[PDB]
């Protein structure tokens, strides 16, 4: 088949040794920066077609992070690739001990649809930096980006080492029978289990970035003007289709209405009175998810928005008040511009509420109180945490990104991408010279024991 | 069931917050220190009955490593557990950026039989240090240690947080239906796949230390007196039942008989003329494995040893020459005191040979040439490497231990154990103060 041949060619090219020298890896990463500059308008067009993105947010909410990762990894690659001496003991003082980094082999990256350039190419950058071959499986749901990357990736990168696999689930299922040395997947909890199961047949390690509802606890005594503007921004970018968007708010009933008003105000400033007319407001990805998201509004008390247009897959920025934790909107990842507010009486009820559910990819808290921030962190678990902002924590080079529990396993970005797509190999190199100190270890053992 | 109730009690205890303060974790580790000291003869006796270990090798080839791990982790725990600041950008000068370590929850350690104290308790030490509840499943193959641990663990440690699950394969399968937050398994490649498959049903991350044939390449023109004493030590300790034993030898045909003679010489020094009479020589764990290893000698040329005693599961230290790589002794992990020698005509052929096969847990080479060593490393892949010695590299606090590909995934020992059994959580803490610097990100975007 087309699929088996692509993997076969990718493994053969890795076995040929071409990816080992750093010079090669850098050329390929440089070919990706050239891809981003030369294909700028093609990239915008595809995101515009897929998700109603524009020239600005296509770059500054997605493409720029791929470029910054490339530039960063290029400059650090020689340091990261070098053998790493570690601490010696008196018994090993005359030896050399170090960690040797080496590629795993052929890496599979399975992309997703919501940021279809970032979540395909940024993982791929890491895997290329670590000297692996990389097979890419784009999500069909972002149809234009999928077809574009199939076309342009082979124009800039090595053809055998970095193939692109077309199709949907049946192709992905077939692809997953093939033998890989690492699999990174971004998507749903349920497919994450399927992918880990398939990985186990070849004992392949996995990086899984999965689902969850990222909570946003808003403190009673904080500046709600600043809080709600930041919350609104993170929640309603990409029409709410972000993995670390604040899914829902937890707040005291005393401040709920103020939050609604400040969310409304910020939303008006961002997108105007009618968000449908804004260039900067996105659209739901597909008919299936439009119907899914609209379904979550039903039966709820709507404070703002609450309508949608099926023909264009537009959903108005929507805020829900006094939301039942057991209702549909609070029982699945929203991934849409519907912001429910669940009421809690204290920090402690909010912590318990978060802990009774599955561990989220991101945890958010808005507060000026340092002890509230430390307490919430200390008593919960989540992939990453941001206090007094949203989104920005997953873009910083110094902060590895990933889930925990149902939100995922493994991590990447920056140095962690390089580690994730390498095997870190402990090495002990001794002199081959008689050492009396070692003779204590050889049989026969002493006939008389001594104290420890 | 009683397995479900144990796992429930361990999770309820974890969720209480009991394991979070470092003082609690250190008290549990100090209790483990007291256990090792107070139960020394009971441990030796169990290892003697299971594996034919003695007082000396019980401690100096197994128990001591657990003690050193405990002592090292107690001392380093505050530093490791502290929030770790990371590098800022000009865009993030007024923020706090740090990695926060926190327990995973309830960790499962599935032990194995060949080093049944080390490979059950040393992982448990790391998981305790990370603030997890730890459920323990010892291997039934080492029956005496299994029983001992079931009795003495609860006598010294928290009874809810750190339960011991008895039984064999059915009970392990039953245990694998329970939801854990991490599984560490040491054992076989085949069962490793079964573990990972069960873990996927709860999306549980795994540390798998599995099998392989750890190659031992012996260079021409190197000091074979020294090399062969070292190879023989690693190969034949614990009657060859070590994960990183030098499984087989690759050597130039011109030094095959020198290697044979040096191995003999060392074997006689270690274990005398009749190894069956040596207090320092072990026995095979079970009838099944005794027959399996004796079977591997069949069809092979015996340069030394080649006899066995079924009743006590003794197999003489055995050297095999001019071995066909397609023969059974070269198609499975040996895990016994049978050392085959496979001839190769060049360093390059040895690299191809190793690369052609599955990635081994360890790779060994013996050479006085630094370039040889570096080349073999650069062009192969294994879990770990030692040049000019065997075994020793998996005992060092500064060298993470673990496999790659068929020899496994993840790693532990030392600081890496703490990381493995914790979640490392990225934290950004910004001021809640109006910032004109951020305003460019908000819509409307400019033209
Ligand atoms: K390095
Ligand atoms: K000695
Ligand atoms: K032969
Ligand atoms: K603006």
């Amino acid at each position: 088949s087309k699929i088996s041949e692509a993997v076969k060619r990718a493994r053969a090219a890795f076995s040929s040794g071409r990816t080992r020298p750093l010079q090669f890896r850098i050329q390929q990463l440089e070919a990706l920066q050239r891809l981003i500059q030369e294909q700028e308008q093609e990239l915008v067009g595809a995101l515009a077609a897929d998700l109603h993105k524009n020239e600005w947010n296509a770059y500054y909410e997605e493409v720029v992070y791929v470029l910054e990762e490339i530039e960063y990894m290029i400059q650090k690659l020689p340091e990261w690739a070098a053998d790493e001496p570690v601490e010696k003991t008196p018994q090993t003082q005359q030896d050399e001990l170090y960690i040797h980094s080496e590629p795993l082999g052929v890496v599979l990256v399975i992309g997703t649809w919501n940021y279809p350039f970032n979540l395909t190419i940024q993982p791929m950058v890491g895997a290329i930096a670590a000297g692996n071959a990389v097979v890419l499986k784009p999500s069909e749901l972002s149809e234009n980006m999928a077809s574009l990357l199939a076309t342009i990736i082979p124009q800039y990168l090595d053809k055998d080492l970095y193939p692109v696999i077309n199709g949907g689930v049946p192709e992905t299922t077939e692809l997953l029978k093939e033998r890989f040395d690492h699999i990174l997947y971004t998507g749903s909890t349920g497919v994450g289990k399927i992918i880990m199961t398939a990985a186990a047949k070849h004992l392949t390690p996995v990086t899984l970035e999965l689902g969850g509802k990222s909570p946003c606890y808003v403190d009673k005594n904080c500046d709600l003007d600043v809080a709600c503007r930041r919350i609104a921004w993170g929640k309603f970018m990409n029409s709410g289709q972000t993995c670390v968007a604040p899914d829902y708010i937890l707040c005291d009933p005393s401040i709920q209405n103020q939050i609604v008003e400040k969310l409304k105000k910020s939303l008006k400033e961002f997108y105007g009175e009618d968000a449908k007319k804004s260039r900067d407001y996105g659209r739901i990805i597909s008919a299936r998810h439009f119907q899914r998201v609209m379904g979550l509004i039903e039966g709820q008390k709507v404070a703002y928005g609450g309508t949608g247009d099926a023909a264009t897959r537009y959903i108005a920025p929507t805020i829900l008040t006094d939301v039942d934790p057991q209702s549909p909107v609070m029982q699945e990842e929203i991934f849409g511009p519907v912001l429910p507010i669940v009421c809690v009486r204290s920090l402690e009820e909010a912590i318990q509420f978060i802990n009774q559910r599955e561990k989220p990819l991101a945890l958010y808290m808005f507060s000026s109180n340092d002890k509230v921030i430390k307490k919430m962190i200390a008593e919960t678990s989540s992939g990453g945490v941001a206090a007094n902002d949203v989104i920005v924590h997953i873009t910083l080079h110094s902060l590895p990104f990933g889930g925990v529990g149902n939100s995922g396993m493994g991590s990447y970005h920056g140095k962690k991408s390089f580690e994730t797509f390498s095997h870190r190999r402990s090495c002990l190199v001794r002199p081959l010279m008689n050492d009396e100190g070692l003779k204590v270890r050889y049989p026969p053992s002493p006939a008389k024991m001594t104290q420890h």
Side-chain angles (χ1 to χ4, degrees), chain A:
Chain A
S1 83
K2 294 175 280 173
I3 281 163
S4 288
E5 185 61 29
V7 174
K8 169 169 168 166
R9 288 177 183 179
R11 182 158 302 282
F14 172 80
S15 297
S16 83
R18 290 196 286 112
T19 65
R20 296 315 193 102
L22 301 184
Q23 179 186 291
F24 178 87
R25 307 184 203 180
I26 287 165
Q27 271 158 197
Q28 296 295 300
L29 295 169
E30 286 176 355
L32 285 179
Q33 28 181 62
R34 196 169 71 253
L35 181 152
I36 289 166
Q37 70 106 337
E38 288 182 358
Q39 301 290 327
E40 187 171 81
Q41 301 302 321
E42 290 79 354
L43 292 164
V44 170
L47 292 169
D50 290 334
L51 292 147
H52 200 254
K53 291 296 202 73
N54 63 44
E55 208 187 320
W56 188 89
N57 59 17
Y59 190 79
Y60 292 104
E61 302 179 353
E62 187 162 359
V63 169
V64 71
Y65 300 121
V66 177
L67 191 64
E68 273 159 11
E69 183 76 304
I70 289 169
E71 180 178 49
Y72 183 61
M73 292 208 190
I74 288 170
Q75 66 185 56
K76 297 285 193 183
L77 183 46
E79 301 179 52
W80 296 343
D83 287 342
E84 192 187 326
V86 298
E87 190 176 39
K88 301 183 192 173
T89 59
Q91 293 72 39
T92 64
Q93 183 58 54
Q94 309 311 313
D95 304 305
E96 305 310 326
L97 334 196
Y98 62 92
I99 296 159
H100 176 81
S101 289
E102 65 202 17
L104 298 168
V106 187
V107 176
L108 173 65
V109 177
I110 296 166
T112 183
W113 52 263
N114 68 326
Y115 291 84
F117 185 75
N118 188 106
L119 300 166
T120 50
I121 306 309
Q122 190 169 164
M124 187 188 198
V125 167
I128 291 160
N132 300 280
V134 191
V135 182
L136 182 63
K137 179 77 213 78
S139 171
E140 85 209 298
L141 295 203
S142 262
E143 187 188 16
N144 294 280
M145 183 59 74
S147 287
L148 174 65
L149 295 165
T151 299
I152 71 173
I153 288 286
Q155 289 184 18
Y156 295 83
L157 303 188
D158 185 84
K159 284 161 64 158
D160 292 9
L161 285 161
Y162 311 114
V164 178
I165 308 298
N166 296 327
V169 177
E171 284 77 38
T172 308
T173 296
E174 277 284 300
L175 186 56
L176 287 162
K177 291 174 176 188
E178 298 293 320
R179 187 167 188 190
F180 295 100
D181 302 289
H182 192 94
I183 303 176
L184 188 144
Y185 168 74
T186 304
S188 64
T189 287
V191 181
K193 298 184 174 176
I194 290 169
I195 281 161
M196 190 171 172
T197 298
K201 302 182 185 191
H202 302 295
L203 289 162
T204 301
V206 296
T207 299
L208 302 175
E209 193 254 89
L210 308 178
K213 301 165 68 67
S214 299
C216 187
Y217 172 78
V218 181
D219 184 11
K220 200 169 76 209
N221 302 292
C222 76
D223 181 331
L224 301 179
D225 293 302
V226 178
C228 287
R229 184 169 174 169
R230 294 175 174 183
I231 289 168
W233 165 72
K235 172 59 180 192
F236 293 99
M237 62 164 51
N238 198 209
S239 186
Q241 298 164 302
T242 307
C243 56
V244 296
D247 185 86
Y248 66 96
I249 298 173
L250 292 176
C251 71
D252 197 290
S254 62
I255 62 169
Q256 182 179 14
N257 316 331
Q258 295 162 76
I259 284 168
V260 167
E261 287 298 305
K262 285 143 204 292
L263 286 169
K264 279 164 67 170
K265 183 173 80 74
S266 288
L267 280 166
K268 268 178 252 289
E269 294 166 357
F270 297 164
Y271 307 117
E273 292 289 335
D274 189 16
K276 188 159 174 57
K277 296 186 195 164
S278 175
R279 78 189 277 261
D280 297 306
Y281 193 69
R283 296 290 184 281
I284 302 298
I285 181 67
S286 69
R288 193 200 193 174
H289 289 111
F290 174 82
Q291 187 177 285
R292 186 183 62 78
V293 174
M294 286 307 301
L296 306 183
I297 295 159
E298 82 173 38
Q300 295 289 331
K301 178 63 183 71
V302 179
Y304 190 59
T307 58
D309 177 39
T312 64
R313 296 191 303 276
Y314 164 80
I315 298 185
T318 301
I319 302 163
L320 313 179
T321 45
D322 297 308
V323 179
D324 190 347
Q326 301 303 124
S327 64
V329 72
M330 284 302 302
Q331 284 298 308
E332 73 178 77
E333 184 164 9
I334 297 168
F335 235 65
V338 179
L339 181 51
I341 302 170
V342 183
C343 285
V344 295
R345 267 287 144 74
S346 61
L347 178 58
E348 287 72 21
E349 199 188 343
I351 284 165
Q352 178 177 17
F353 186 93
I354 290 160
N355 288 358
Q356 284 178 8
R357 283 149 179 270
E358 297 293 332
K359 298 183 192 173
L361 181 55
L363 175 47
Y364 299 126
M365 63 216 69
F366 284 77
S367 182
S368 308
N369 201 113
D370 281 348
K371 332 310 163 184
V372 167
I373 291 166
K374 302 305 266 279
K375 183 159 165 58
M376 178 154 274
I377 286 167
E379 299 192 12
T380 60
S381 181
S382 71
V385 167
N388 295 323
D389 214 354
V390 285
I391 312 298
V392 57
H393 75 285
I394 72 171
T395 62
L396 304 177
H397 298 314
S398 57
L399 296 182
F401 165 76
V404 64
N406 271 208
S407 60
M409 68 182 68
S411 61
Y412 72 113
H413 290 186
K415 193 175 196 304
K416 211 76 226 296
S417 277
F418 182 90
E419 293 171 14
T420 287
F421 298 124
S422 305
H423 173 240
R424 287 167 63 76
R425 185 179 187 191
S426 294
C427 299
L428 168 66
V429 179
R430 321 203 86 156
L432 192 62
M433 287 154 50
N434 184 56
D435 186 353
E436 295 299 317
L438 297 180
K439 283 181 193 172
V440 64
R441 81 201 179 164
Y442 301 124
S445 59
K448 294 168 160 68
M449 300 299 99
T450 48
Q451 288 290 331
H452 308 326

